[PDB]
Target: Acetylcholinesterase
Amino acid sequence: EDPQLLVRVRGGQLRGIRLKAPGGPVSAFLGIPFAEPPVGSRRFMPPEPKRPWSGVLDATTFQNVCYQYVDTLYPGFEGTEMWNPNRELSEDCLYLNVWTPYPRPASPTPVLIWIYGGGFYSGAASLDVYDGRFLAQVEGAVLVSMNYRVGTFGFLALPGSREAPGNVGLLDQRLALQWVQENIAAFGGDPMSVTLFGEAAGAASVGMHILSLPSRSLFHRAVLQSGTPNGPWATVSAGEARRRATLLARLVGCPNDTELIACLRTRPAQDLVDHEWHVLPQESIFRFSFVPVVDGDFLSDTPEALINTGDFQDLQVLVGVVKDEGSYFLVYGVPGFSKDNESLISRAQFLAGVRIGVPQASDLAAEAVVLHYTDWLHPEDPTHLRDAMSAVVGDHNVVCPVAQLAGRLAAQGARVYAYIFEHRASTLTWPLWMGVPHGYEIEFIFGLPLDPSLNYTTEERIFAQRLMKYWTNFARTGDPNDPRDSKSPQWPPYTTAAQQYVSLNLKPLEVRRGLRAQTCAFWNRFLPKLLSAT
Amino acid sequence: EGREDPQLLVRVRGGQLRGIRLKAPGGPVSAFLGIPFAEPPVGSRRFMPPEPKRPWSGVLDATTFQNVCYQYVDTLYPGFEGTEMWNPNRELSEDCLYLNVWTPYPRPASPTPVLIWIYGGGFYSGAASLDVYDGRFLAQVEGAVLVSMNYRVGTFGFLALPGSREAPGNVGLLDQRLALQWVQENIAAFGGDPMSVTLFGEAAGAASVGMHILSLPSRSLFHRAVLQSGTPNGPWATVSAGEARRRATLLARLVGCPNDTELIACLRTRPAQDLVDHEWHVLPQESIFRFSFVPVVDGDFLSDTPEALINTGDFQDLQVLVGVVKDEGSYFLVYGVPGFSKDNESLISRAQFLAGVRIGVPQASDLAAEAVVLHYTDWLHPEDPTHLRDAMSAVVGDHNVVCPVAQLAGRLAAQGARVYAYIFEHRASTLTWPLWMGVPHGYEIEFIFGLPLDPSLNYTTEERIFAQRLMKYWTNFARTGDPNDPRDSKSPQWPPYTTAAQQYVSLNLKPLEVRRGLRAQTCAFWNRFLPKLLSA
Ligand SMILES: CCCC(=O)SCC[N+](C)(C)C
Ligand SMILES: CCCC(=O)SCC[N+](C)(C)C
Model:
């Protein structure tokens, strides 16, 4: 028995496993329960803290993935399967993972907490791209990641009901956060320095914790990668959640909220997932059925209302986008688009893809979108039409929501740093036309290219090392700049006036001004006026 | 008594004329100024279509310019060259229907291509007698026969009670058409070729050219057309029958005239100056680049809207040259936008910008106006007074001239025409307008007419070489339907404008440069989106 691999936490003893990382050993503690399994009558309910255990709990292995839809668009294809569940599916999934340096850090170390994405309908802390070993070994970080409930199980709401109050997947995340405060010191973590970070739905989750008071006493800094609490996909109204939950209940034969929810509890997990996608009001892409709900509790108003009116003066935020946020999503519903060809579309196909990409758009607003993204020098060129369709989806769903958030936080006294991620991995299996798709910066931030067996280039290892530094420098200090290394250019803070951000690629940092400024004025200032008059 | 210059005595349908031998840098030219082409439209003939001039006896002296048509005279900056050069330079009178002819001296032996000029001035002003419209240089250097006519403006030209007999509308256009008929019958007496006639005009002159293209009885009177900074389509060049009736009866009320016969009869008893004094009071909004009395869609001269006629016409047999200057709008800003002046740099605020947009785009609802503002803001420096000043100029420029031109070039090209497109980018060294105004509306004209060739005018040597170039493009086009010099292969070519390639050339001191797309992105907003936005 290795004594470095034994830890006493409040609920009892744990045994971890020593992992090798290219530069040396790390301690992993995998599959630690942080809550009572949310099963049977506990389905749809706020999580309860895990009861203590006797003896030494085996924490050498990943636990089950929360029950979720499994992707079947391209069976066997690495570019999709890499996001699919890599352990067994179970409703019993409230577990977290901790990586630390080996030996256990002598003094308290900044803690990074990862929250995965998956549109609130999927994800798992156990995926290869979320491997905490590299950041633990190189930067000396304590990395934590949790499972949280997705789809119906995490976000089905009958607002105002005691038995399905909404947002329980966020409350799972909150409980893991409280677990870190109570327990991370035992691992050599510093509970007084906790940085949240996430991508996509995970970034929106981080944003929601910023906007929810009881969560604010559990972290100090935040990183939001390609996702925001504001925007078209991240929240629903109470009225709209009620509709979807009762619609899903009709689809599975149920049944007075008590009656309805009691009947939903008798249903096998897969019965619920089977119909999960049949409750959306429109034919759409980048929209998900069960997401955080504006309940007047976890979220006391809309993310929009809360970001305009908040005080973020003692807050540091790192925020950014990848180069081609929307390309990924096009193949999941827009006619004319596939990974197996060049996807050169017609104008007809472009107009029709806009209605699906902006499902809430009226006739007028859609043509405003089309007219705005057309190249009037080459109105019918199939390459521009394809790239523009990709741009429509990325801008509406990520880039412009991100620009809006960055501006509001900076204005409201926060310290903001912004980026665009432009390097496409040499090992990427998606076609070239997709460029740098939603999700493909994660493997670099986590430092995977340092594994020589993964076949990344030498340049990409040096790059991964740069990014791992910006991220942990940010966690340590609230500033991603190397505090003892000189060299201009420095990464400047994002401000509403200058709007400075940096590009992250193989070349040294470049400072740019204005994050799709003209285009986002269309989505953030004009389009709302056009809909609030139809 | 037969001691006068044998080369200055010419006979026309109406009788004998005596012209004058003028001096031009390269040699003498022949000028026949103030030839009457219509009965004077006075008294019971006010508002009425023109009647052909009745023949005179003996030799009519045609050695001086005639009266300028009664009109509003500019008083914004009195004594200032920038405005005075456009002001009337002869007595104002309703007796004003005269044309002018310039020809080589001696008159050419072989039939010579004819250029006809139609002046601008918003349909409320202008005169063929102004220094910038001097035909002597095109006549001497290019051997051209040049003709310019006076036509009625303001109320006298365009006040209309549509449907009536006594004031049918578009009579100023009918003056222009009568002078075109006069050229057909008479120009051969001067050595001109009636079978090669090219119309050309700037601003409202350009729009007039365009209306002659769209009006059937005019089409047989000319062969080629040049439209400078103006178009028959767009927001200012025409009005509906209903709106023209509205403006006419309002004018009547304001001057003491409270059945159309009765109302027109009372209008005809008012002094000319009273009508002018009240002209501007009938505009529906506070505005710039809008004029009270313009061509009307009467179902007669214009069988439908200019917009409809360019969309459905067959233009296979048409050659057209069209273009714009670099800063079409800047001129108009000092005549009504709070914040703007010729005597300072006119740096403005956001508030002043939004306020100016309501004036510059007077027909816009609140939604459309924020569309304009949001589109023209630079969101990296949304409060920079220099950018805001320039965007304001661009808004008015784009909406009134540049995008109507782009629509015109596109529709004619799609409908079979041969179109050549330019942007004129050279600021005259002699300009008295402040630098911020760039190259304003109207300041290519002096170059096309070759004024820099006159040494007493203080233009630079490069400006002479440049004026000579443009005179060649313009007259090659008149001659052949093609601006390019058949000999010169080394010189860069001017390609036709098409829908697929959208090619046009820059006109400056440097050799021709081909650019693609005529404010394509921005003009898509004005021509495609805005209409659809105003339809709700
Ligand atoms: C270049 C156009 C000049 C005018 O609009 S004149 C109008 C001036 N006023 C309204 C005072 C009569
Ligand atoms: C006072 C010099 C400014 C100019 O060059 S005026 C033309 C403005 N703009 C270049 C924006 C069209």
